[PDB]
């Protein structure tokens, strides 16, 4: 069910690179805090 | 130029927004170009053609 997925390894690599870059970006730009509003 | 107690200085103008705009596109234009590569060799399945 994933044989068609391994036959295009290059697309998977490009998608993984895009995802890694997007994740690094959102992590660099995500707001961080501690004990958020809970009252 | 000395400063008097109770005085502040700041800068502004069009230039400011530019410092962002270029940066922003300088961050995205590459990725867009990559979106071309991945989508280009789908008809050829080889990098040389793209």
Curated annotation (Swiss-Prot), chain B:
Sequence intervals crossing the membrane: 24-44
Compartment(s) where it occurs, according to its Swiss-Prot or TrEMBL record: Cell inner membrane
Induction section of the entry: Transcriptionally regulated by CusR in response to copper and silver ions.
Superkingdom, taxonomy of origin: Bacteria
Function text: Part of a cation efflux system that mediates resistance to copper and silver.
Further comment found in the protein's record: The cus system plays an important role in copper tolerance under anaerobic growth and, under extreme copper stress, in aerobic growth.
Quaternary structure (record): The cus efflux system is composed of CusA, CusB, CusC and CusF.
Family, as annotated: Belongs to the resistance-nodulation-cell division (RND) (TC 2.A.6) family.
Protein name: Cation efflux system protein CusA
Organism listed in the record: Escherichia coli (strain K12)
Full-protein interval shown: 848 to 897 of 1047
């Amino acid at each position: 069910i994933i044989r068609r997925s391994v036959a295009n390894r290059f697309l998977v690599l490009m998608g993984a690179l895009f995802l890694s870059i997007w994740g690094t970006w959102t992590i660099i730009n995500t707001p961080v805090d501690a004990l958020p509003d809970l009252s | 130029v000395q400063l008097k107690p109770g005085t502040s200085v700041a800068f502004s103008g069009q230039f400011e927004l530019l410092e962002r705009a270029n940066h922003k596109l300088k961050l995205m234009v590459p990725m867009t170009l990559m979106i071309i590569f991945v989508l280009l060799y789908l008809a050829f399945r080889r990098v040389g053609e793209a």
